């Protein structure tokens, strides 16, 4: 699915990211943009042979499995297939996980270099939330 900037915003909302570890939505919208473009079914391999999946690109290194990544870590206890479907629960439930595990939203490089500290209230400006 690629959701649009304002359906993506209510879809998060609904699911409780809205400052969720103090990250207001439009922080969140943003990270998704620059991540995946708002596609549901975004996939990139990573240069070590781990894999990002999804809405947010949550890495198989650490998060999900996929079968494929040694040495890796599943710690949102899912596969790394279920970060691709239409409904955004098990992207959102995880992202939970990893914005909590100390280092906030620098987790996403794409946040840190294309949102921190910019006007990020902008994505979610006009939409009925
Ligand atoms: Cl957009
Ligand atoms: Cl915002
Ligand atoms: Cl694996
Ligand atoms: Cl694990
Ligand atoms: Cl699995
Ligand atoms: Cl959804
Ligand atoms: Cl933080
Ligand atoms: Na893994």
Same mark, same amino acid.
């Given at each position: 699915k690629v959701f649009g900037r304002c359906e993506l915003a209510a879809a998060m909302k609904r699911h409780g990211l809205?400052?969720?570890? =103090?990250?207001? $939505?439009g922080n969140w919208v943003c990270a998704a943009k620059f991540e995946s473009?708002?596609?549901?079914q975004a996939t990139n391999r990573n240069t070590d042979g781990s894999t990002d999946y999804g809405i947010l690109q &949550?890495? /198989?290194?650490?998060?999900?499995?996929? =079968?494929?990544? +040694? =040495?890796?870590?599943?710690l949102c206890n &899912? +596969?790394? /297939?279920? $970060? $691709? /479907? /239409?409904?955004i629960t098990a992207s959102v439930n995880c992202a939970k996980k990893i914005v909590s595990d100390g280092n906030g939203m620098n987790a996403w490089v794409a946040w840190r270099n294309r949102?921190? =500290?910019?006007?990020?209230q902008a994505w979610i400006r006009g939409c009925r939330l």
């Open positions: 809205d400052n969720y570890r =103090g990250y207001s $939505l473009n708002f596609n549901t &949550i890495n /198989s290194r650490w998060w999900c499995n996929d =079968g494929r990544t +040694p =040495g890796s870590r599943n &899912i +596969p790394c /297939s279920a $970060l $691709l /479907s /239409s409904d949102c921190k =500290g910019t006007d990020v």
